[PDB]
Amino acid sequence: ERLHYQVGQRALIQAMQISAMPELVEAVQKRDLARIKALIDPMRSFSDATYITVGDASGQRLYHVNPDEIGKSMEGGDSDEALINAKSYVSVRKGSLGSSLRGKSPIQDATGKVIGIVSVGYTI
Amino acid sequence: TEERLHYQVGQRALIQAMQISAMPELVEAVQKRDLARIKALIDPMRSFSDATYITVGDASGQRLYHVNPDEIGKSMEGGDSDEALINAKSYVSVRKGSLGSSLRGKSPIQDATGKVIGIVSVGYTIEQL
Ligand code: NA
Ligand code: NA
C-alpha cells in the first residue's frame, strides 16, 4: 500500500544519505562516540523519524536515542543484509522501542569494507 | 489538508534539504566556494535519492551546483528562495524552475554564527509525480 511504501522511501533515503557522510565514516573509524552524537543529534532534530541508530561492523550500538542502549547489540534480527552484503533496504521488526518500519544502509570505508550501519525508523 | 502523495513527497524533499544543508562538509565547501568539492558531496546525495534535482546556491542565490553544469554561475529560478536566504526558514514550495514545474523543499546553509551563506533546494518535477 502507498503509506508504508512512501514512509519507507523517506526512511531509506535518510539511511543511505547519512551513512555516506565523510564525517560519519571517519567518526566510526576512530570510534569517537562524542563526534557521532554531535553529527546525529542534529539529523534527528530535522527528521520526523522516531529514531536513528548507528552500529559498528558487528551490530553493537555506537549511538541510540537512549544512552543506556549504547554498547549493547542492535535488536530485531534484520541487520546482516547490510553488515555482510552491503545492501540498503526497508524492513519491519520489533526493536527496543516497539514495532517499527526502518530503512537501513551500511557505512563503508575507502576500500568498500563495511565498518558500520545506519538504521532510521518509524514506529507503526 | 494536502493530498497523500503531495504531502509524502513534500516531507521527504523538506527533510533532505534540512539534513543536507546542515552537513559540516558542505558548510565548509560553500565557505571556500570550492565548486569541485560541492560536486563531490552532492553527486552521491542525488544518486541515493528519487529527487529530480538538487541545487546549491550561495548567499545571493547564484548557483554553485546544478544538475546541468551550464546553469552554474546563473541565478536560481522560481522567485521562492528569499524566506530561506534572508529569514533562515525551511519550507516546501511549488514553482516553475529551469527544469519545468516542480515541488521543492528548501533550507538555508549557515556558518557557526548563524549567518546564512547559501541554500539547498531538493525538488521533484510535477510531470514525474
Ligand atoms: Na550506505
Ligand atoms: Na538548514
Domain with A3 in it: what CATH number? 3.30.450.20
Report the C-alpha gap between B11 and B22 in whole angstroms: 17
Method: X-ray
Give the helix/strand (H/E) hosting B110.
Answer: strand B100-110
Distance of alpha carbon B118 from alpha carbon B33, whole angstroms: 10
Could you tell me the end-to-end alpha-carbon distance of chain A, in angstroms, rounded to an integer?
14
CA distances from A38 to A29, A73, B22, B23, B113 (A): 15, 22, 12, 11, 17
CB contact under 8 A, B12 and A9: yes
Q: Which residues contact B80 (CB under 8 A, 6 or more apart)?
A: B93, B95, B104, B106
Query: Any idea which residue has 514512509 for its cell?
Result: A7
Cα A20 to Cα B94: distance, rounded to the nearest angstrom:
29
- Rounded CA gap, A50 and A69, in Å? 15
Record: contact A17-B22, CB cut-off 8 A: no
Distance of CA B13 to the CA centre of its chain: 9
Residues of A contacting chain B (CB within 8 angstroms): 2-3, 6-7, 9-10, 13-14, 16-18, 20-23, 39, 42-43, 46-48
Nearest-ligand number for the alpha carbon of B120 = 2
Closest approach of B45 to chain A, Cα-based (Å): 6
Residue B110, phi then psi, degrees to nearest 5: -130, 150
Which residue segment(s) compose the domain that B70 sits in? 1-129
What is the CA(B86)–ligand 2 centre distance, in A? Answer: 12
3-state DSSP assignment of residue B20 = helix
Distance B3 CA to ligand 1 centre (A): 31
Task: Decide if A17 and B48 are in contact by the 8 Å CB cutoff.
Answer: yes
Q: How many domains does chain A have?
A: 1
Cell 520489533 locates to A94
